[PDB]
Amino acid sequence: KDLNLTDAQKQQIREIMKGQRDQMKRPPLEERRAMHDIITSDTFDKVKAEAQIAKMEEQRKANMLAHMETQNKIYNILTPEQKKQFNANFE
Amino acid sequence: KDLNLTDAQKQQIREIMKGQRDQMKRPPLEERRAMHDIITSDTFDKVKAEAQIAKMEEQRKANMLAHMETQNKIYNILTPEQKKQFNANFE
């Protein structure tokens, strides 16, 4: 992402990235303990991990989604000469 | 991670990682290329986005699981005192 953007662009991104972080709630505070709990055990059991993971589906699905909305929206702030250069770096 | 572990661990950690991190297959072209082709689109196709996220979920599941399994195999190769400070890190 270095397409010689203008002094209007970066700030428009600023409004959407603050839409990509906050409102789009990222942290469940007790599950980051769970991961710890399963790894920090001397005896490993898959089902304990299998059934923690998929509780982290609602959160990680709704994220991937929300993120794509925002990164699309920045694409749409671009110009034809800028959209060009961005597309090609993906390759 | 600077537990002051032995030469043997530094090596066992290396062959645990290369043991099953080469058991989880990394990102696939048509799932990846579309992840971004959804973004470079003219207008954010919502419905469409949800369907990629899914097609990508189960495969991603086995990649979180193997991760935790190797982090446990790594954990289970530590001793009492170093186990006490790794836990104290995240806490």
Side-chain angles (χ1 to χ4, degrees), chain A residues 1-3 71-72 74-76 78-91, chain B residues 32-43:
Chain A
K1 41 203 275 169
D2 62 341
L3 327 167
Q71 267 166 328
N72 202 192
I74 145 182
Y75 181 86
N76 275 223
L78 257 30
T79 62
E81 54 270 60
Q82 287 167 352
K83 292 190 192 196
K84 193 175 188 170
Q85 202 191 335
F86 191 21
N87 288 306
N89 219 311
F90 269 150
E91 319 289 332
Chain B
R32 247 197 148 170
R33 285 164 188 163
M35 259 173 72
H36 85 68
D37 273 338
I38 284 152
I39 299 161
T40 80
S41 207
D42 305 313
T43 220

Side-chain angles (χ1 to χ4, degrees), chain B residues 6-82:
Chain B
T6 75
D7 279 28
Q9 332 224 264
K10 203 166 160 191
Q11 152 70 10
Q12 279 175 309
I13 281 168
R14 195 183 287 108
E15 87 174 323
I16 276 165
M17 272 180 157
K18 258 199 168 185
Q20 283 178 21
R21 197 161 171 258
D22 299 48
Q23 195 100 329
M24 57 199 206
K25 308 174 95 161
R26 277 295 154 210
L29 26 72
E30 195 169 312
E31 303 209 349
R32 247 197 148 170
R33 285 164 188 163
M35 259 173 72
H36 85 68
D37 273 338
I38 284 152
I39 299 161
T40 80
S41 207
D42 305 313
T43 220
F44 179 68
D45 182 334
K46 194 194 168 189
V47 166
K48 191 198 214 181
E50 292 141 333
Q52 157 62 3
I53 299 179
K55 209 200 183 195
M56 210 199 178
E57 197 192 64
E58 176 75 34
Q59 57 177 42
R60 184 183 66 84
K61 281 193 189 309
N63 303 184
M64 280 170 132
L65 195 75
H67 175 60
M68 295 160 142
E69 214 183 13
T70 69
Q71 276 204 293
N72 167 92
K73 282 207 182 85
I74 288 162
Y75 180 80
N76 290 180
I77 223 133
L78 268 50
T79 51
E81 31 272 5
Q82 34 184 208

